[PDB]
Amino acid sequence: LKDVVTREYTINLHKRLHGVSFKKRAPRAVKEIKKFAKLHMGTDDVRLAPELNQAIWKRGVKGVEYRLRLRISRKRNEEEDAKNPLFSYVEPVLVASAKGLQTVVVEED
Amino acid sequence: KAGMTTIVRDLDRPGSKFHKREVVEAVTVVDTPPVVVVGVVGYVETPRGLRSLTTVWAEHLSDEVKRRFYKNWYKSKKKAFTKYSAKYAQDGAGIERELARIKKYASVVRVLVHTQIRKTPLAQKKAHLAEIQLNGGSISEKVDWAREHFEKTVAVDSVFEQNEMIDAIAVTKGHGFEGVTHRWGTKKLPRKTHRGLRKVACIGAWHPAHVMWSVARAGQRGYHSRTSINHKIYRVGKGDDEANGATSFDRTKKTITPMGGFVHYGEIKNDFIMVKGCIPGNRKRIVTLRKSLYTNTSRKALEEVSLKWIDTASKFGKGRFQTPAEKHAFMGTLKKDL
Amino acid sequence: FNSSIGRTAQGKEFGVTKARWPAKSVKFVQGLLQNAAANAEAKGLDATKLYVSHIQVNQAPKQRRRTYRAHGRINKYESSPSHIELVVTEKEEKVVRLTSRQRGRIAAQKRIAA
RNA sequence: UUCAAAUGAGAACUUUGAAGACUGAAGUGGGGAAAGGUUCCACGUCAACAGCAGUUGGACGUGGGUUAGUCGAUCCUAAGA
RNA sequence: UGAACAGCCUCUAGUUGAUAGAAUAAUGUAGAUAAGGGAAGUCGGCAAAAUAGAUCCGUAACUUCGGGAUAAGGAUUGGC
RNA sequence: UUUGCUCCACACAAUAUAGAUGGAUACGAAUAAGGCGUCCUUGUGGCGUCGCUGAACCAUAGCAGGCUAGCAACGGUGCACUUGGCGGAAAGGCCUUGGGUGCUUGCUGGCGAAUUGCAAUGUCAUUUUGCGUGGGGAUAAAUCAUUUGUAUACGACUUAGAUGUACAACGGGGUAUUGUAAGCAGUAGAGUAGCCUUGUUGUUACGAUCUGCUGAGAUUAAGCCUUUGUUGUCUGAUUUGU
Ligand SMILES: [Mg+2]
Ligand SMILES: [Mg+2]
Ligand SMILES: [Mg+2]
Ligand SMILES: [Mg+2]
Ligand SMILES: [Mg+2]
Ligand SMILES: [Mg+2]
Ligand SMILES: [Mg+2]
Ligand SMILES: [Mg+2]
Ligand SMILES: [Mg+2]
Ligand SMILES: [Mg+2]
Ligand SMILES: [Mg+2]
Ligand SMILES: [Mg+2]
Ligand SMILES: [Mg+2]
Ligand SMILES: [Mg+2]
Ligand SMILES: [Mg+2]
Ligand SMILES: [Mg+2]
Ligand SMILES: [Mg+2]
Ligand SMILES: [Mg+2]
Ligand SMILES: [Mg+2]
Ligand SMILES: [Mg+2]
């Protein structure tokens, strides 16, 4: 209902990158994450945190992690909003393991 | 078509070296839940061929068969057959007149049946609708049979029996565009060949100054209609029957479903047909099983088949256990606890 | 100008199989459409009735470059520029010669069917 | 190759940061000889040019820049002229 | 690392330039694998495969006595 | 989605015509045989008659066919209203029943016609369509976009999606692959170098490896199966009318 919302998801990048050319595993993972955010938040504008880009590229172009824990926050697009007034911001969640976790609505309000 | 598995049976063929000996045979399992009769079609003979005269439908049609009449079901108002169902208002006089027209005319009678795809582990939800010819009895008796069978189900045991020779009609597995080497089986050209060796070297003489229709050329491979014949039924299994996969020699309570389910299909919850060998089409594909067009007395037909054992090991790998109980007995206690 | 271009489902609404998405052409055309709309507003025309009554693309003079080919050869490498013009307009909403016979017949009909 | 920010009417390609890579010292480093001739550098700037693009550029416009008793030439002779 | 200015990886320095996005039909180009057979292929073993470093054994015909020769043919190799 | 769509009737306008100008007038067979009528004992029967072309038969008279008066018979034809019966080869037509309502040239009268000027198709049919009038009737879909992979170069195909055996993303379980994770510990370990009160499995340091927790850990649909869990999603665009 309310448009500004933050949830933590686990994305399965292994099944999304299955059989992808090695020199484009990490770029494809970036686009896969943007598609994942658009699916879950309905926002065409998706912005990736640079520390998330670091997490994606941590083991090179070829060694993207099988699973990734993401904090996706749909926020109001202020300061001359684009075609849509909402955008998704994707951040890495510091976890020892990305296994066994379910989608949780996180609120710090 | 659900998948394929393996059986062991005694061979009964006097004069054969394997007479009264066990043979291992591949079989194809077809998931066959009962079909729903929802209409009848009358066919008249004409000097231009067989012509449909009229179609009479049942009063009530389920959503799974009404989906077949829609390209965008979720968006539609679902008006199909709503005004037709009003012909059953006072006494079904219009329905009776149409059935009388079929009885009077219509040298050929066919019923309309649809699958209960909701009883299969398919995501489709849209039932398949087909015409099936009725054989036996006069035309009036055929029309009557359809009349009392409207909106009723017909199980596969009332159509097919053990040891019967049947025919499989299905569209084969598609492979898209294919070269001549695998589409037609032509010889590969030598390694030294410039500009490609998976080709036919000469596609025609100088005359006729055209490429002949009979030359092997690249194109669509697979997704063709095929009518394969003479497949012997090995088991008419019942869905409401524990120990579907068990025989009189085995007596281990297990269904026909392999461990982990049929790969890419799921589990067999319904009645099913087990036929010797393989049939055209891939798993999940709709297939039509037809009774034999001729009487077969080849002694390979009319040979009673008694299964001794059905393989239910997992087909998702080199499955080496038939049941979870057998796996637990062999392996013992694991770190996982139940 | 469509020979050996690809096919798409998005041409169904126009009854064709060959359709594309020429972004630069679209941007130039919508720039000129914005100009025509602004001209109509300056003239005082009603914006809701406006429709593209005339649109016409002509070949502008070609702009030359050279491309280099095998065996030390040189070919033309030309742009095909455009002149575009468009006009938006507002929507808006017997002597008889009869011969003598013909006249006499008509008179006879008049005095017979009265 | 990727993410973000800045700039900009406009950014896959400009700038900065972050990351991932490569050349791996008979280098994708640092200098020179022949040759080129201002291409060096700055400011402005994008009509044309740059295998797309371009806010960038060996482009375009305007300027600035090459300091010797000791480094060379200049002198000597070589095959030669 | 290694015999090594070989190949492979890294530091200083430099670059990240070569139109891009999407999808993985046929036929290609480049790189590969293959049951059993093993040149039956083909003008022709073309192409490919097999061999390969080092240590220790063991090396024939012939010879201009210098060679042939790494002939042929075998064994060993890590870590601690 | 403009008061849209559809059927019926009449009014106008347009459109065209492979070509109205009294009637396409229905047995089946044989042809070295038949048709029709008749009779009988019902037949491959007797008798008679016919053809030798449809040159027939039926329709045919009236200002392109008007108005009006009778006579004679109760017939013939048209129009709706009708009672049914039959016809599926492409039936869409055929046979009927009963009244009404016109016409009747079956037979006798009376009035009209002219000048289209001595001919000029001299316009009399019938596909189709639109705009109107007044009377009934009904109240959807398809495509794009998204989605699946039983499909696939692209088109195409095959699936799903407006509150549910709903779909999806995760999580759980099963299935499968590999082969025993990390960490901790050990009176395991060729030993070597120290330190002691030289234990009688003493301490310290280095030590491939070994053993236990541990058929463990990891991966598992990306074109595997399953799901009483968690979190979400579910009216955007275009077009189509007899
Ligand atoms: Mg692959
Ligand atoms: Mg060649
Ligand atoms: Mg298998
Ligand atoms: Mg062409
Ligand atoms: Mg082409
Ligand atoms: Mg093309
Ligand atoms: Mg060139
Ligand atoms: Mg040249
Ligand atoms: Mg680039
Ligand atoms: Mg350019
Ligand atoms: Mg510069
Ligand atoms: Mg300059
Ligand atoms: Mg000097
Ligand atoms: Mg390259
Ligand atoms: Mg082989
Ligand atoms: Mg072998
Ligand atoms: Mg040969
Ligand atoms: Mg030879
Ligand atoms: Mg060779
Ligand atoms: Mg020799």
Side-chain angles (χ1 to χ4, degrees):
Chain A
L1 292 174
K2 289 181 182 158
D3 282 336
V4 171
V5 62
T6 318
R7 306 196 198 91
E8 293 179 353
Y9 304 82
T10 287
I11 182 170
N12 183 4
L13 292 167
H14 188 200
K15 85 188 209 184
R16 267 153 190 97
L17 309 183
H18 184 254
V20 168
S21 293
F22 282 144
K23 280 313 168 67
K24 39 191 72 155
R25 292 294 187 103
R28 173 82 46 106
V30 165
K31 298 192 175 211
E32 280 322 289
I33 281 159
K34 280 184 196 186
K35 210 196 306 303
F36 188 86
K38 169 169 184 170
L39 172 66
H40 280 308
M41 292 295 174
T43 52
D44 201 33
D45 172 335
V46 173
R47 298 191 213 162
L48 312 192
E51 64 274 18
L52 174 70
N53 186 60
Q54 279 204 39
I56 292 151
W57 283 86
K58 183 68 182 294
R59 298 185 307 183
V61 72
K62 203 170 46 175
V64 185
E65 290 266 41
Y66 291 146
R67 272 169 183 89
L68 214 64
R69 192 73 180 163
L70 307 175
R71 177 184 279 221
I72 308 182
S73 54
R74 192 172 55 213
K75 295 182 183 293
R76 200 97 47 191
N77 190 358
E78 304 94 6
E79 193 35 68
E80 202 269 319
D81 61 324
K83 301 178 182 181
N84 44 1
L86 292 170
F87 73 93
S88 285
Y89 189 63
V90 190
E91 285 188 287
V93 170
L94 275 299
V95 288
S97 178
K99 294 195 64 47
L101 305 165
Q102 313 181 25
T103 301
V104 293
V105 171
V106 62
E107 56 261 6
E108 290 164 359
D109 311 335
Chain B
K1 183 171 179 189
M4 273 169 63
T5 177
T6 313
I7 68 162
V8 175
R9 75 179 187 92
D10 272 341
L11 187 89
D12 185 13
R13 258 208 287 264
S16 170
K17 291 177 71 68
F18 264 69
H19 174 61
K20 282 162 189 180
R21 283 176 73 177
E22 284 177 352
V23 289
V24 160
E25 289 173 345
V27 299
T28 296
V29 180
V30 184
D31 198 17
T32 59
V35 302
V36 181
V37 177
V38 294
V40 62
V41 187
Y43 281 100
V44 294
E45 294 217 287
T46 74
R48 289 181 285 167
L50 188 64
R51 169 169 99 76
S52 66
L53 177 69
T54 196
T55 299
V56 176
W57 294 87
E59 191 171 359
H60 298 282
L61 280 298
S62 63
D63 276 354
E64 64 183 350
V65 73
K66 290 171 75 170
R67 274 168 177 275
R68 171 60 56 198
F69 314 122
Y70 285 97
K71 298 297 188 178
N72 311 99
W73 169 263
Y74 79 113
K75 261 195 313 194
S76 86
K77 304 295 187 70
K78 293 155 189 64
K79 302 294 297 308
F81 284 96
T82 52
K83 293 183 164 159
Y84 183 92
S85 301
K87 298 161 136 64
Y88 289 83
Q90 283 84 52
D91 62 320
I95 301 307
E96 290 296 314
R97 302 192 263 110
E98 305 316 290
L99 298 175
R101 291 178 61 221
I102 298 184
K103 281 185 187 112
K104 187 162 165 214
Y105 307 108
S107 54
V108 171
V109 174
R110 305 197 186 147
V111 290
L112 283 153
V113 310
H114 77 80
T115 57
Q116 295 178 109
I117 197 154
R118 73 190 206 281
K119 291 196 195 287
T120 77
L122 294 180
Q124 176 155 319
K125 281 193 249 203
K126 190 198 275 190
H128 287 97
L129 179 73
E131 268 176 24
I132 297 188
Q133 197 164 285
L134 289 179
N135 267 354
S138 64
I139 293 293
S140 183
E141 287 165 330
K142 292 176 209 272
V143 181
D144 294 327
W145 189 97
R147 179 70 272 175
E148 69 271 13
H149 279 83
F150 279 174
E151 302 156 35
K152 305 278 182 70
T153 53
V154 170
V156 70
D157 65 358
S158 87
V159 180
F160 288 126
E161 277 202 82
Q162 168 81 5
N163 304 313
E164 184 178 4
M165 287 306 198
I166 69 163
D167 305 336
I169 301 107
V171 176
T172 60
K173 185 193 281 170
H175 296 103
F177 211 84
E178 188 66 86
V180 293
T181 296
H182 200 87
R183 184 190 210 217
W184 295 104
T186 58
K187 177 74 58 186
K188 283 176 70 191
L189 304 178
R191 186 209 47 91
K192 289 179 74 169
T193 308
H194 185 49
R195 55 175 64 110
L197 57 87
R198 291 183 74 76
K199 291 163 146 192
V200 164
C202 166
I203 60 151
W206 193 321
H207 284 101
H210 302 85
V211 186
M212 302 291 276
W213 64 290
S214 57
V215 178
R217 290 182 71 76
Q220 165 75 24
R221 166 168 96 93
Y223 208 73
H224 308 310
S225 301
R226 283 301 179 264
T227 302
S228 188
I229 66 151
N230 281 327
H231 310 299
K232 188 179 258 285
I233 295 175
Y234 278 179
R235 166 161 306 198
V236 182
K238 298 289 88 176
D240 51 5
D241 161 29
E242 69 281 27
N244 281 336
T247 69
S248 69
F249 169 80
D250 195 7
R251 306 233 298 270
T252 298
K253 184 176 289 292
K254 69 184 193 183
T255 54
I256 197 71
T257 310
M259 296 177 71
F262 274 108
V263 176
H264 288 103
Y265 185 79
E267 294 147 295
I268 306 294
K269 298 295 185 69
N270 318 286
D271 312 311
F272 62 89
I273 298 314
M274 170 189 284
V275 287
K276 185 214 190 184
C278 52
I279 70 164
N282 50 340
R283 79 283 182 273
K284 301 190 263 215
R285 174 75 49 84
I286 180 71
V287 59
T288 313
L289 304 177
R290 183 190 62 191
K291 272 158 151 307
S292 193
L293 298 187
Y294 70 108
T295 182
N296 203 3
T297 58
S298 82
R299 189 192 269 213
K300 185 177 179 180
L302 73 164
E303 191 276 334
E304 294 83 3
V305 161
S306 177
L307 314 184
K308 296 188 74 174
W309 172 79
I310 308 174
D311 180 35
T312 51
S314 170
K315 268 76 185 178
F316 201 43
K318 313 281 169 83
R320 63 194 209 62
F321 302 108
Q322 302 290 313
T323 51
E326 176 184 1
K327 164 149 152 171
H328 191 95
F330 188 87
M331 295 177 68
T333 289
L334 293 168
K335 193 170 173 207
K336 309 197 316 273
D337 289 319
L338 270 299
Chain C
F1 309 115
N2 61 1
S3 67
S4 49
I5 73 159
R7 302 193 278 203
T8 180
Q10 279 182 31
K12 270 164 161 162
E13 81 171 276
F14 309 110
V16 310
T17 56
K18 301 204 254 169
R20 270 188 173 170
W21 305 261
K24 185 186 285 187
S25 303
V26 171
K27 272 151 192 281
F28 269 105
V29 164
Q30 71 198 358
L32 287 175
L33 280 174
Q34 183 177 2
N35 182 261
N39 293 337
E41 193 44 17
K43 271 176 89 145
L45 307 173
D46 188 4
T48 68
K49 294 181 180 180
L50 288 175
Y51 76 101
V52 177
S53 71
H54 168 81
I55 189 161
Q56 163 194 289
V57 179
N58 259 327
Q59 306 186 228
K62 288 182 168 271
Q63 264 187 303
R64 280 69 191 195
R65 284 182 279 156
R66 291 185 326 180
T67 185
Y68 300 99
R69 317 303 301 266
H71 303 99
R73 281 169 306 104
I74 288 174
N75 291 160
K76 91 198 175 63
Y77 207 70
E78 274 163 18
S79 300
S80 300
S82 299
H83 300 315
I84 312 165
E85 53 169 66
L86 62 94
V87 173
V88 294
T89 307
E90 285 164 311
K91 298 291 180 69
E92 292 282 337
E93 304 91 347
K94 313 184 148 71
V95 59
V96 74
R97 316 190 86 94
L98 301 173
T99 77
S100 172
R101 284 90 63 190
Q102 284 170 295
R103 292 193 302 266
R105 171 182 195 259
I106 284 147
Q109 277 176 348
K110 288 190 285 189
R111 66 183 183 273
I112 291 299

